Write a protein that binds this DNA or RNA. Structure first.
Ligand code: NA
Length: 206
DNA sequence: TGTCCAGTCT
DNA sequence: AAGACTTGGAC
Protein backbone atom coordinates (compact mmCIF):
# COMPACT_ATOMS: atom_id res chain seq x y z
CA UNK A 1 0.00 0.00 0.00
CA UNK A 2 0.89 3.68 -0.20
CA UNK A 3 0.68 3.81 3.61
CA UNK A 4 3.56 1.34 4.17
CA UNK A 5 5.55 3.16 1.54
CA UNK A 6 4.99 6.51 3.21
CA UNK A 7 5.75 5.11 6.68
CA UNK A 8 8.91 3.26 5.58
CA UNK A 9 10.40 6.50 4.31
CA UNK A 10 10.03 8.47 7.54
CA UNK A 11 13.20 7.53 9.44
CA UNK A 12 15.29 4.49 10.33
CA UNK A 13 13.07 3.25 13.17
CA UNK A 14 9.96 3.23 10.96
CA UNK A 15 11.49 1.65 7.87
CA UNK A 16 12.67 -1.01 10.31
CA UNK A 17 9.41 -1.47 12.23
CA UNK A 18 7.47 -1.72 8.97
CA UNK A 19 9.81 -4.42 7.66
CA UNK A 20 9.68 -6.33 10.95
CA UNK A 21 5.87 -6.31 10.89
CA UNK A 22 5.34 -6.71 7.15
CA UNK A 23 2.36 -5.75 4.99
CA UNK A 24 -0.46 -3.48 6.26
CA UNK A 25 -3.28 -5.95 7.00
CA UNK A 26 -5.77 -4.06 9.18
CA UNK A 27 -8.51 -5.91 11.08
CA UNK A 28 -11.68 -5.01 9.16
CA UNK A 29 -14.01 -7.26 11.13
CA UNK A 30 -16.20 -4.26 12.17
CA UNK A 31 -16.42 -2.35 8.86
CA UNK A 32 -19.96 -3.43 7.99
CA UNK A 33 -21.35 -3.11 11.51
CA UNK A 34 -23.55 -0.29 12.81
CA UNK A 35 -21.82 2.46 14.82
CA UNK A 36 -23.55 1.54 18.09
CA UNK A 37 -22.14 -2.00 17.89
CA UNK A 38 -18.53 -0.82 17.37
CA UNK A 39 -19.06 1.89 20.06
CA UNK A 40 -20.05 -0.85 22.53
CA UNK A 41 -17.00 -2.95 21.60
CA UNK A 42 -14.84 0.14 22.24
CA UNK A 43 -16.52 0.57 25.63
CA UNK A 44 -15.77 -3.09 26.39
CA UNK A 45 -12.16 -2.44 25.37
CA UNK A 46 -11.61 0.63 27.57
CA UNK A 47 -8.74 0.22 30.03
CA UNK A 48 -8.53 -3.60 30.26
CA UNK A 49 -6.10 -5.84 28.33
CA UNK A 50 -7.50 -7.27 25.10
CA UNK A 51 -8.21 -10.77 26.44
CA UNK A 52 -10.43 -9.38 29.19
CA UNK A 53 -12.10 -6.88 26.86
CA UNK A 54 -12.92 -9.67 24.36
CA UNK A 55 -14.18 -12.07 26.99
CA UNK A 56 -16.62 -9.37 28.12
CA UNK A 57 -17.72 -8.36 24.62
CA UNK A 58 -18.07 -11.97 23.42
CA UNK A 59 -20.38 -12.76 26.37
CA UNK A 60 -22.48 -9.71 25.47
CA UNK A 61 -22.89 -10.50 21.78
CA UNK A 62 -23.89 -14.00 22.92
CA UNK A 63 -26.94 -12.95 24.92
CA UNK A 64 -29.32 -12.10 22.11
CA UNK A 65 -31.67 -12.26 19.15
CA UNK A 66 -30.88 -15.49 17.33
CA UNK A 67 -27.13 -15.08 17.83
CA UNK A 68 -27.45 -11.57 16.41
CA UNK A 69 -26.03 -8.57 18.28
CA UNK A 70 -28.54 -7.12 20.77
CA UNK A 71 -30.64 -4.36 19.18
CA UNK A 72 -30.83 -0.92 20.80
CA UNK A 73 -34.39 -1.72 21.96
CA UNK A 74 -33.23 -4.96 23.61
CA UNK A 75 -30.33 -3.19 25.34
CA UNK A 76 -32.49 -0.39 26.73
CA UNK A 77 -34.94 -2.97 28.05
CA UNK A 78 -32.33 -5.48 29.21
CA UNK A 79 -32.06 -6.52 32.87
CA UNK A 80 -29.08 -4.89 34.60
CA UNK A 81 -28.15 -8.18 36.26
CA UNK A 82 -27.30 -9.94 32.99
CA UNK A 83 -25.11 -7.08 31.78
CA UNK A 84 -23.29 -7.26 35.09
CA UNK A 85 -22.75 -10.97 34.47
CA UNK A 86 -21.12 -10.17 31.14
CA UNK A 87 -18.52 -8.31 33.17
CA UNK A 88 -19.47 -4.66 32.58
CA UNK A 89 -18.98 -2.27 35.49
CA UNK A 90 -21.89 -0.22 36.81
CA UNK A 91 -20.67 2.87 35.00
CA UNK A 92 -20.20 0.89 31.78
CA UNK A 93 -23.69 -0.56 31.99
CA UNK A 94 -25.07 2.98 32.24
CA UNK A 95 -23.02 3.96 29.16
CA UNK A 96 -24.39 0.95 27.28
CA UNK A 97 -27.93 2.10 28.11
CA UNK A 98 -27.09 5.68 27.07
CA UNK A 99 -25.75 4.33 23.79
CA UNK A 100 -29.00 2.39 23.27
CA UNK A 101 -31.05 5.52 23.85
CA UNK A 102 -28.81 7.72 21.71
CA UNK A 103 -29.11 5.18 18.90
CA UNK A 104 -32.89 4.98 19.17
CA UNK A 105 -33.03 8.79 19.15
CA UNK A 106 -30.57 9.25 16.29
CA UNK A 107 -27.87 11.07 18.27
CA UNK A 108 -25.81 8.02 17.36
CA UNK A 109 -26.47 7.75 13.64
CA UNK A 110 -26.76 4.78 11.33
CA UNK A 111 -23.68 3.68 9.42
CA UNK A 112 -24.96 5.44 6.29
CA UNK A 113 -25.40 8.73 8.14
CA UNK A 114 -22.17 8.59 10.15
CA UNK A 115 -20.20 8.19 6.93
CA UNK A 116 -21.11 11.73 5.91
CA UNK A 117 -19.84 13.43 9.05
CA UNK A 118 -16.28 14.67 9.62
CA UNK A 119 -14.03 13.07 12.24
CA UNK A 120 -14.34 16.30 14.21
CA UNK A 121 -18.14 16.30 14.19
CA UNK A 122 -18.39 12.67 15.26
CA UNK A 123 -16.08 13.26 18.17
CA UNK A 124 -17.88 16.36 19.41
CA UNK A 125 -21.29 14.81 18.94
CA UNK A 126 -20.56 11.36 20.37
CA UNK A 127 -18.52 12.44 23.39
CA UNK A 128 -21.74 14.12 24.64
CA UNK A 129 -22.67 10.63 25.85
CA UNK A 130 -21.42 9.79 29.34
CA UNK A 131 -18.92 6.95 29.14
CA UNK A 132 -17.72 7.90 25.70
CA UNK A 133 -14.48 9.87 25.45
CA UNK A 134 -12.29 10.87 22.50
CA UNK A 135 -10.44 7.58 22.42
CA UNK A 136 -13.72 5.68 22.23
CA UNK A 137 -14.85 7.67 19.18
CA UNK A 138 -11.44 7.28 17.63
CA UNK A 139 -11.86 3.50 17.85
CA UNK A 140 -15.11 3.98 15.90
CA UNK A 141 -13.37 6.17 13.33
CA UNK A 142 -10.67 3.51 12.88
CA UNK A 143 -12.51 0.18 13.13
CA UNK A 144 -15.83 1.08 11.65
CA UNK A 145 -15.75 4.17 9.44
CA UNK A 146 -12.56 3.62 7.51
CA UNK A 147 -10.94 6.89 8.59
CA UNK A 148 -7.29 6.71 7.52
CA UNK A 149 -5.64 9.58 9.38
CA UNK A 150 -6.44 8.92 13.02
CA UNK A 151 -3.83 8.65 15.80
CA UNK A 152 -5.33 7.87 19.25
CA UNK A 153 -2.60 9.49 21.36
CA UNK A 154 -4.28 8.62 24.69
CA UNK A 155 -4.01 4.88 23.84
CA UNK A 156 -1.80 3.04 26.32
CA UNK A 157 -0.59 0.59 23.64
CA UNK A 158 0.11 3.42 21.19
CA UNK A 159 2.39 5.01 23.79
CA UNK A 160 4.14 1.67 24.45
CA UNK A 161 4.50 1.55 20.68
CA UNK A 162 6.57 4.74 20.74
CA UNK A 163 8.48 3.50 23.77
CA UNK A 164 9.47 0.61 21.51
CA UNK A 165 9.90 2.56 18.27
CA UNK A 166 12.07 5.23 19.89
CA UNK A 167 13.84 2.87 22.32
CA UNK A 168 12.58 5.03 25.19
CA UNK A 169 13.36 4.16 28.82
CA UNK A 170 9.94 4.99 30.30
CA UNK A 171 6.57 5.29 28.50
CA UNK A 172 5.90 8.57 26.62
CA UNK A 173 3.07 11.03 27.18
CA UNK A 174 -0.02 11.79 25.11
CA UNK A 175 1.59 15.09 24.02
CA UNK A 176 4.79 13.34 22.99
CA UNK A 177 2.82 10.94 20.81
CA UNK A 178 0.95 13.96 19.47
CA UNK A 179 4.18 15.74 18.55
CA UNK A 180 5.95 12.79 16.92
CA UNK A 181 3.07 11.25 14.94
CA UNK A 182 2.47 14.31 12.74
CA UNK A 183 4.98 13.01 10.19
CA UNK A 184 2.71 9.98 9.75
CA UNK A 185 -0.10 11.97 8.09
CA UNK A 186 -2.08 11.36 6.05
CA UNK A 187 -1.66 7.75 7.16
CA UNK A 188 -1.66 7.87 10.94
CA UNK A 189 -4.28 5.16 11.09
CA UNK A 190 -1.76 2.75 9.47
CA UNK A 191 0.92 4.14 11.77
CA UNK A 192 -1.23 3.26 14.78
CA UNK A 193 -1.73 -0.27 13.48
CA UNK A 194 2.08 -0.73 13.24
CA UNK A 195 2.47 0.75 16.73
CA UNK A 196 -0.13 -1.65 18.17
CA UNK A 197 1.91 -4.52 16.67
CA UNK A 198 5.06 -3.71 18.63
CA UNK A 199 3.86 -5.66 21.69
CA UNK A 200 4.07 -8.95 19.79
CA UNK A 201 7.64 -8.45 18.48
CA UNK A 202 10.35 -10.81 19.78
CA UNK A 203 12.18 -7.53 20.27
CA UNK A 204 9.50 -6.28 22.71
CA UNK A 205 10.52 -5.60 26.32
CA UNK A 206 7.95 -4.86 29.04
C1' DT B 1 -4.51 -20.55 47.97
C1' DG B 2 -3.35 -13.55 45.86
C1' DT B 3 -1.71 -9.41 43.67
C1' DC B 4 -1.34 -6.28 40.14
C1' DC B 5 -2.45 -3.76 36.38
C1' DA B 6 -3.97 -3.62 31.50
C1' DG B 7 -10.33 4.80 29.52
C1' DT B 8 -13.79 7.57 31.81
C1' DC B 9 -15.98 10.56 35.03
C1' DT B 10 -15.80 13.06 38.52
C1' DA C 1 -9.24 15.47 40.09
C1' DA C 2 -7.11 11.05 42.55
C1' DG C 3 -9.19 7.45 42.51
C1' DA C 4 -12.94 3.78 41.75
C1' DC C 5 -14.18 0.58 38.56
C1' DT C 6 -14.62 -4.23 35.88
C1' DT C 7 -12.06 -9.39 34.32
C1' DG C 8 -8.01 -12.06 33.17
C1' DG C 9 -2.80 -13.07 32.46
C1' DA C 10 1.32 -13.12 34.60
C1' DC C 11 3.44 -14.09 38.38
NA1 NA D 1 -18.41 11.86 27.18
Amino acid sequence: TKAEIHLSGLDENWKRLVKLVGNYRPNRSMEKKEPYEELIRAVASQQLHSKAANAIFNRFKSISNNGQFPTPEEIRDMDFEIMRACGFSARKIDSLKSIAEATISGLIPTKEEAERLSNEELIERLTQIKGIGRWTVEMLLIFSLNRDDVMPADDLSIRNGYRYLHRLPKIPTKMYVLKHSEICAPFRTAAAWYLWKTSKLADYTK
